[PDB]
Amino acid sequence: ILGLSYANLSGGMQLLPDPLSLPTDNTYLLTITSTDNGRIFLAGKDGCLYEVAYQKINHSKSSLDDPILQIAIDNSRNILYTRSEKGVIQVYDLGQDGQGMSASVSQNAIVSAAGNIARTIDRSVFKIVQIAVIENSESLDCQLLAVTHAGVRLYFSTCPFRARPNTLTLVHVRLPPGFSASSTVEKPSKVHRALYSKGILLMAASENDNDILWCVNHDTFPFQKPMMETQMTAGVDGHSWALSAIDTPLNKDHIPITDSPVVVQQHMLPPKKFVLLSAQGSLMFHKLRPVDQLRH
Amino acid sequence: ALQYFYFLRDEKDSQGENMFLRCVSELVIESREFDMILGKLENDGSRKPGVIDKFTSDTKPIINKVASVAENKGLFEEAAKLYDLAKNADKVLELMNKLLSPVVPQISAPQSNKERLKNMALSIAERYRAQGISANK
């Protein structure tokens, strides 16, 4: 564990070893995540979960699928999510005395969930590319969004309590625009894909001919009642290693009400800039403000 | 005319200065000698200065004023010219697309290979697009 800081004189980067070593020989630590409690949870290629405490000791939460491909934390609700290789999700309630769970969503649950639509979410086809947590601030009800290989977006609601999680339910689903629903435009969709706070979707698609990048941004403005998403192709053509938000999110309020009004915080909020990392280089994307739109 | 109007400043003080400015503004408007008065063609290399620019200053605001007026009259070309000076690149292309767009639909027998709206189209694209293009995709 080391510390990162910025020199105030040079403005250079300072790294100092905070000599803290933790033996984790057997683990083959695949993933690491943290809760802003400062707690760090990591998984080895040893099942689902483990947690580290610096104050070295390792303690398995899940008491001493197959692997845990991804780990995600819902900062707002102190909720942990784990995605396994098989596509099962587990959401543990992070508590002071440990993790409480584990409710799960699986392909079966999803099938029951649709109860009205189905195909892209076929058994054979069904696979999960990525999972993203949704802040309670953005939506009280919706805990998580799942992105499938197909590029379908699944939204699940939940209900926590001080010690008990609730099983997630499938609130809603969105399909990729081939044009419309049967679309294979998003097929296939890589894990690289991620959702930016306030539902901005960056889709990395790897066709079986090449790599394509798409972005969907809800039109907040018309969103001052109806919902509409503006989706367009992006310049990047190379493999897309990872996406990140350089800047805080533009969201205006810390409540579901007026959370999304970009219009209100266009002035105040810093310009949104997005990172696309490719093997070859870093690409920077900039959000277009309403001023720019008017300008066009 | 510009040379004479410029003398007005010789009486140093506000009022006269504005009178000078108004006079120049009045000259540009209705004379419509934009290229001569305001400037011309970028080839990158910003404006090639007009006579007034040599004298200098408030020139951007006059351009917007003239350009908007061009819009009333519908004197397209003048508007495009004015917006180029304004450096409203996006606006230029959009007006431009409109101009080229109509005249495309119609009936045939035209388009010599050397001068007009099409030719104008070629000028702008070559011109702007390579260079740090500010226009919308």
Swiss-Prot record, chain A:
PTM section of the record: Phosphorylated. Phosphorylation and dephosphorylation may be important for the function of NUP155 and may play a role in the reversible disassembly of the nuclear pore complex during mitosis. Disulfide-linked to NUP62. The inner channel of the NPC has a different redox environment from the cytoplasm and allows the formation of interchain disulfide bonds between some nucleoporins, the significant increase of these linkages upon oxidative stress reduces the permeability of the NPC.
Localization, UniProt: Nucleus, Nuclear pore complex; Nucleus membrane
Tissues in which the UniProt entry reports expression: Expressed in all tissues tested, including heart, brain, placenta, lung, liver, skeletal muscle, kidney and pancreas.
Family: Belongs to the non-repetitive/WGA-negative nucleoporin family.
Function, in words: Essential component of nuclear pore complex. Could be essessential for embryogenesis. Nucleoporins may be involved both in binding and translocating proteins during nucleocytoplasmic transport.
Quaternary structure and partners: Interacts with GLE1. Able to form a heterotrimer with GLE1 and NUP42 in vitro. Forms a complex with NUP35, NUP93, NUP205 and lamin B.
Disease note: Atrial fibrillation, familial, 15: A familial form of atrial fibrillation, a common sustained cardiac rhythm disturbance. Atrial fibrillation is characterized by disorganized atrial electrical activity and ineffective atrial contraction promoting blood stasis in the atria and reduces ventricular filling. It can result in palpitations, syncope, thromboembolic stroke, and congestive heart failure.
Protein name: Nuclear pore complex protein Nup155
Taxonomic placement: Eukaryota, Metazoa, Chordata, Craniata, Vertebrata
Residues of the full protein shown: 175 to 522 of 1391
Curated annotation (Swiss-Prot), chain B:
Protein family according to the UniProt entry: Belongs to the nucleoporin interacting component (NIC) family.
Gene for this chain: NUP93
Disorder noted: Nephrotic syndrome 12: A form of nephrotic syndrome, a renal disease clinically characterized by severe proteinuria, resulting in complications such as hypoalbuminemia, hyperlipidemia and edema. Kidney biopsies show non-specific histologic changes such as focal segmental glomerulosclerosis and diffuse mesangial proliferation. Some affected individuals have an inherited steroid-resistant form and progress to end-stage renal failure. NPHS12 inheritance is autosomal recessive.
Name under which the protein is recorded: Nuclear pore complex protein Nup93
Subunit structure and binding partners: Part of the nuclear pore complex (NPC). Component of the p62 complex, a complex composed of NUP62 and NUP54. Forms a complex with NUP35, NUP155, NUP205 and lamin B; the interaction with NUP35 is direct. Does not interact with TPR. Interacts with SMAD4 and IPO7; translocates SMAD4 to the nucleus through the NPC upon BMP7 stimulation resulting in activation of SMAD4 signaling. (Microbial infection) Interacts with SARS-CoV translation inhibitor nsp1; this interaction may disrupt nuclear pore function.
Function: Plays a role in the nuclear pore complex (NPC) assembly and/or maintenance. May anchor nucleoporins, but not NUP153 and TPR, to the NPC. During renal development, regulates podocyte migration and proliferation through SMAD4 signaling.
Subcellular localization, as worded in the UniProt entry: Nucleus membrane; Nucleus, Nuclear pore complex; Nucleus envelope
Disulfide bonds: none
